[PDB]
């Protein structure tokens, strides 16, 4: 059973701004998603210090970047804390309302889209390069979920019956037809080195079989 939800109006407005504004420096989406993975890895590491059983779902803390030219996807995988159903359906968008307002005010005042992570809403910069985003996620003591949106004001959430993850999050970017450069090894390597070089977890860039 797939449930469909409307974004809060302020979040729909942010997503439309990201999709519609002319802004050539699209590559900053990857730093934003890696930074989110790093924060989620920090969170499970910290919680594990007082409850070590939180790592029973996996001790390895790391990030994989996986391009797939057949599927036209770039996937950002982490073994961080993961997200609950309440996170996906209400709580993250609730928090994002204030950062959206501030971000949009700052843009009117002269800021640019690359500063989006200073407002806590960098995830939505995925829509600079993706026509659809699918988030697969598993938090301790909750089930595995798939969130999905092609923008347009709505998103879906379902329980995910696919390959079980131990714990963590996969952000699957279904790239726009004209954004396939972000599947190329040399392009991703360049962006990771430019914007993500001091992240405190291994980042493994997978390479394409074909
Ligand atoms: C880090 C951090 C905390 C914020 C939530 N979050 C995000 S960003 C996000 C937002 C703002 C809204 C929606 C509907 C979906 C997502 C993925 N990425 C991850 C991640 N890799 N692991 C755990 N939580 C994450
Ligand atoms: Mg929302």
UniProtKB/Swiss-Prot annotation:
Disulphide connectivity of cysteines: none
Coiled coil start-end: none
Outcome reported for the amino acid change (mutating residue 32 to A): Strong ATP-binding. Strong interaction with HSF1, HIF1A, ERBB2, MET, KEAP1 and RHOBTB2. No effect on interaction with TSC1
Post-translational modification: ISGylated.
Residues given in the record as ATP binding sites: 36, 78, 97, 123
UniProt family annotation: Belongs to the heat shock protein 90 family.
Protein name, per record: Heat shock protein HSP 90-alpha
Organism: Homo sapiens
């Amino acid at each position: 059973e797939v449930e469909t939800f409307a974004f809060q109006a302020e979040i729909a407005q942010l997503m439309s701004l990201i999709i519609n504004t002319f802004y050539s420096n699209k590559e900053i989406f990857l730093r934003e998603l890696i930074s989110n993975s790093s924060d989620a890895l920090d969170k499970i590491r910290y919680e594990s210090l007082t409850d070590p059983s939180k790592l029973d779902s996996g001790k390895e803390l790391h990030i994989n970047l996986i391009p797939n030219k057949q599927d036209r996807t770039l996937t950002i995988v982490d073994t961080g804390i993961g997200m609950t159903k309440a996170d996906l359906i209400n709580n993250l968008g609730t928090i994002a309302k204030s950062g959206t307002k501030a971000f949009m005010e700052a843009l009117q005042a002269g800021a640019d889209i690359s500063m989006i992570g200073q407002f806590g809403v960098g995830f939505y910069s995925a829509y600079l390069v993706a026509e659809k985003v699918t988030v697969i996620t598993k938090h301790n003591d909750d089930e595995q979920y798939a969130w999905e949106s092609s923008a347009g004001g709505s998103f879906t959430v379902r329980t995910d019956t696919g390959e079980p993850m131990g714990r963590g999050t996969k952000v699957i970017l279904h790239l726009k037809e004209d954004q396939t450069e972000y599947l190329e090894e040399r392009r991703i390597k360049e962006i990771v080195k430019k914007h993500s070089q001091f992240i405190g977890y291994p980042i493994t860039l997978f390479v394409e079989k074909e």
